[model samples]
Target: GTSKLKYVLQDARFFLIKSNNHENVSLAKAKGVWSTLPVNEKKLNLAFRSARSVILIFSVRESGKFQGFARLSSESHHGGSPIHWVLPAGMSAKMLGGVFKIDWICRRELPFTKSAHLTNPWNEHKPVKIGRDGQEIELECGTQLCLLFPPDESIDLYQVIHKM
Candidate 1:
């Protein structure tokens, strides 16, 4: 018996940018932002309109740790950014999933680096199938990843896919 497998692949990459800079925001402002947000819907509108996906890689200074990381993709007219905004924890997850259609959740050690690949054969050497969603698939970060995009170039979806 033969079974049909339909796969939809979405690839993303996360680059951790570290900075000690922190801008103070009042609790009132945070509360205001939170209140205005759609609890059931995640918004993706951002200043960096060219990015199809955004990786919020944090560099923690307390213990010099990476703390955690989140990846978001563009949904319609929305995109993610590194800006600090107020939102519920669950809303963050839902937003990432909703916008990108693929999300990678990790809380490992700090300054950790790894490449992920996805394919039908499940290549361990390649670490394939790390981001498959039912018939949908999303791969993030890999050896072939490159920063070749020109300052004026639009986000190359194919490059992301091939690198993953």
Candidate 2:
């Protein structure tokens, strides 16, 4: 059962969302990124039923640009389609824009060297089959990296990432 604990690091669900419009992008910058993704309600619930956390990686529609990521309190969000997710209860800002923004941060500050649009832990082995429900939301990535918790680091990275 100890392996179970180790797997906890990877227990979180990953959802890839793409969008063409910037309105939703602007909304997250001014407010925390927490909302119902444009996906089938029933399917969404089914996909995330047991998971307490989910990582939403956004990208440009067809462009494959990484906008950013958001941390969702999936454990707190339940019931019904269009389930609205909320940010964790600490250190959230519209200006912060989820967790990480590849464009805003200096190249040195970036945690990963590979294109954020590619070679993430989740997608390294193979492209995740998110299907139709996964692609509906007009979300973008690279600019903003949304995660249930800052990927690969929490307090240490969180402190340095949002000092602005």
Candidate 3:
């Protein structure tokens, strides 16, 4: 294959993808959360809360494609640094552009549990405040993922839907 390989979304934009890989992660808990994330506001976010590693998915609206992306929990690698992603930044999946909605969190360590709050299976990473806040912001985030192609320029991207 005389070409490069990368994770492309419904739109023709690039995301910063890391090398670390995670498997069948336990679903994150979602209860007793506090935040006023607009149901129509785009919020690209995640919360491992010192987790080992977790895979995040951004499900799009048009193609129904799951923009697969993963990253190791800060505690496991970078001393739990507060990583940020600007719309222009590249090199992480959290930077992709699209009308992505419903980010499914799965941690390699946390196994399934009848309780999305009890840290799945026997309870492990028992819920925390910051963690819940992270989820809340995104669930109430913007679904208007898109490629910011200025009218002055020429581009073919899955135009962003104005959920506003």
Candidate 4:
């Protein structure tokens, strides 16, 4: 007998990443960088496959609260450094002619439980609503324990904080 794993299908392209407060502040002020991102290749295979654009949401590691998000086309890549990657957020990638856009969010804080509405242990489940529209909106191994979203709708990240 053959054993294999299959994933629940959905159309989503957003990804959540972890960053420290200092880095988060740096990102917010600079609005971009060629920084390193934790690569979840094994867990994030689904995202890599369907992404024309990738949205990276940065969560504060010390606080476990979401801080900001960045948009990059499927054009960024590892820059040969073991830990650093060429993330062209808010800039044009000269090699591929793609633009990386970024948006920083939230002054106050909300736990994953409150903001994400995810179970104590996140399941491979449906999208939860965040930011705006009050409407609608991932995992690997133990996974990073973060989440992803669909890009069809825009996130009013500022509005999201106010609701909290």
Candidate 5:
């Protein structure tokens, strides 16, 4: 018997320089990038709590194209909004604008999950909680991962993530 397997790995990493001056721009850029994700409302909120930096990898098919894919990462549940930092006002705008471009291309959906919580082999403990308002908030555990993709075209997926 023979078996065939296919995998898709689309991961983007936005590195952060360890300097106070770059914080604001970095956060802005990160926010810009996050805004474009096409995930469900609940999942989007969860992503805000968990993301550290935005990473997106995808492929395109025209007319009728079908393929199987897999999502993998060195970083796991800790994935979501980027960590906070300070940056010059001017730099922040530029970084944010750049991130927006990618969002535009992806046309992502809201609250998309890269890997299911229980299915994630790397995740040991569950994501932590924050706040007393019953809102789920994961503390700044260094950095996190969040997935983004399109529910369909004709939507400004990039702009949403870039601005968020």
Candidate 6:
């Protein structure tokens, strides 16, 4: 009960998603950080000082076109610029094909002092769920950010952190 509710700042699931195979929750449906993470991405790190929750997407980018995936720790300590945390073991440029590029997506504006979803009227509009029996013919964000409705089903990719 508390755990599910603990991380949310009520900002809504404003994380937009777009991809090739699925469109369960597109950009109109949003997602913020760590409302919760998935079963697979939850590897432990002292970064949590604890540990806990954490997308691919098309129609949006984290994608099916994955060379691979890695999880560096979250921001345990803060600084002026963002933290460029490290990847997992043997998980680096060597892995991403002598990689030289990376893409990132972050909240447009939010107070780091508090949670983004807090004060967010996230319950505005629940994303219309799509039937997964087959790939729905494909579908659609004017951009900017807003807290939104219920838990979105699938994750989406925003930018590209690909091999240069």
Tell me the TM-score of model 6: 0.17
- Compared with the true structure, model 5 gives a TM-score of 0.20
For residues 1-164, write the lDDT of model 3, one tens digit per residue. 10111122211211211111111111111211111123211332333332222224222222222233222222122223332222222333333212222222221122122112322111234421112211321211111111111121222212211110
- Using Cα atoms with residue i matched to residue i, what is each candidate's TM-score against the true structure? 0.27, 0.42, 0.20, 0.40, 0.20, 0.17
Candidate number achieving the greatest TM-score relative to the actual structure: 2
lDDT of 3 at 25: 16
Superior by lDDT: candidate 1 or candidate 4 = 4
Supply the TM-score for candidate 2: 0.42
lDDT of each: 0.29, 0.36, 0.22, 0.36, 0.26, 0.22
Q: Candidate 5, which segments miss by more than 4 Å at Cα?
A: 1-54, 57-105, 112-119, 125-150, 154-164
Name the runs in model 2 displaced over 4 angstroms.
1-9, 34-38, 74-164
Per-residue lDDT over 12-89 for candidate 5, one digit per residue giving the tens place of the 0 to 100 score: 222111122333323433343321112222333344344433323222212111111111122222334454433334
Candidate 6 local lDDT, 1-164, one digit each (tens): 22232232122112222222222222212311111122112221222233231111112123322111111224222223322223334444222121111122322222222223232223233322221111111112111121222222232232122211
Give one digit per residue, the lDDT tens place, for model 1 in 75-125.
322344333434544545334232222232222333324223223232333
lDDT of 2 by residue, 48-92 (tens): 565443445555444434455543433224333331224334523
lDDT of 2 at 45: 51
Cα shift from native, residue 64, model 5 (Å): 34
In candidate 4, how many Å is residue 19 off? 1.2
TM-score-wise, the better of 1 and 3 is 1
Q: Model 4, 1-164: lDDT tens per residue?
A: 00100111113245555543455345443645324322343333344455433445555555645554444323344443232223445532332222233333222334656444452223335423232111112323111222222221333444322322
